[PDB]
Amino acid sequence: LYDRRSIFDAVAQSNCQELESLLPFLQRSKKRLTDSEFKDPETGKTCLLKAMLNLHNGQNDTIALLLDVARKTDSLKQFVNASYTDSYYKGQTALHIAIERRNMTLVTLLVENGADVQAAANGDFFKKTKGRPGFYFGELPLSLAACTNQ
Amino acid sequence: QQMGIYAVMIEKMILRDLCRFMFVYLVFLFGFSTAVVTLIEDGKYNSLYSTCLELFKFTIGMGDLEFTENYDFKAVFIILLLAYVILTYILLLNMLIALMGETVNKIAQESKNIWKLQRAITILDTEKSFLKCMRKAXXXXXXXXXXX
């Protein structure tokens, strides 16, 4: 069995083992990696997104496994494309983060598993400082990738 | 911060200026005024005080030149004046502007932070001098420079 907490901890330390029994779990319960219960109820963060924050050397293969699991249930598209819902990071997707981190490899990977390239990150974190701040590029992956000189 | 700069400068000049300058002007005016009192026998311009006051007006912009008819030796008193009038307001004035100009090469730029100190002291005191009433007591600055 797996609750939200269980996976998020596994992800935090790049553990691909504690997620050995993962796929077969939501096969029995037919639960989806995308269920309401597998996201933070106030931000909309998913395990993939936790993984995106918990990088070590711009690397995490909990990602590769996490994606793999989502296709086997074909949560695939809406999984890779889930966005933040809090006023701060609203509309931020994993692809936004990969770029923010200047990580070709993870941009490449996300685009190949079908990240929406037109997804607008539009929360207060992506507009001019309250100061909050900060910082605006606006919104769309291309725009980001240019404004950060990439 | 516009008003403040103006406020600081006047106070600084006043502290600097009177000792270096108020005294020197007093000496030039004192000497010449004494020279004049000796010069005049009668008519109330004999008094050091009346004569000195008459001598001051030259500096104000109200100078009367040869105000007094009374006295002896004719024009020498006028030459005595022309020098003092030429000598003190005017010889004295040029060097006085010049030092400020030389600083005004500089301090004006250094100073503005000087006001900054004044606000800090006023603020620090009110809270301390505000009864140490409940008041804030985390700092962070929103930042965004790349550098990326």
State the resolution, in angstroms: 4.2
A133 Cβ under 8 Å from any chain B Cβ: yes
- CA distances from residue B141 to A129, B2, B29 in whole angstroms, order as listed: 11, 26, 58
Q: Give the residue carrying structure tokens 């009367």.
A: B64
The CA distance from A40 to A47, in Å, is 9
As a whole number of Å, the CA-based R_g of chain B is 26
Instruction: Collect all residues with Cβ–Cβ distance below 8 Å to A70 and sequence separation of at least 6.
Output: A33, A34, A76, A79, A80
Q: Which residues contact A148 (CB under 8 A, 6 or more apart)?
A: A99, A100, A102, A137, B146, B148
The three-point CA angle A118-A122-A125 to 5° equals: 130
A126 to chain B, minimum CA–CA distance in Å?
A: 12
CA angle at residue B95 from B90 to B96, to 5 degrees?
A: 90
Q: Name the experiment that determined this structure.
A: cryo-EM
Question: Is B140's Cβ below 8 Å from some Cβ in A?
Answer: no
What is the DSSP-derived secondary structure letter of residue A150? -
SS3 state at A29: coil
Give B131's Cβ-side CA count (13 Å radius).
Answer: 3
- Smallest Cβ–Cβ distance between A129 and the set B142, B146, B148 belongs to B142
Find the residue in A nearest to B143 (Cα). Answer: A133
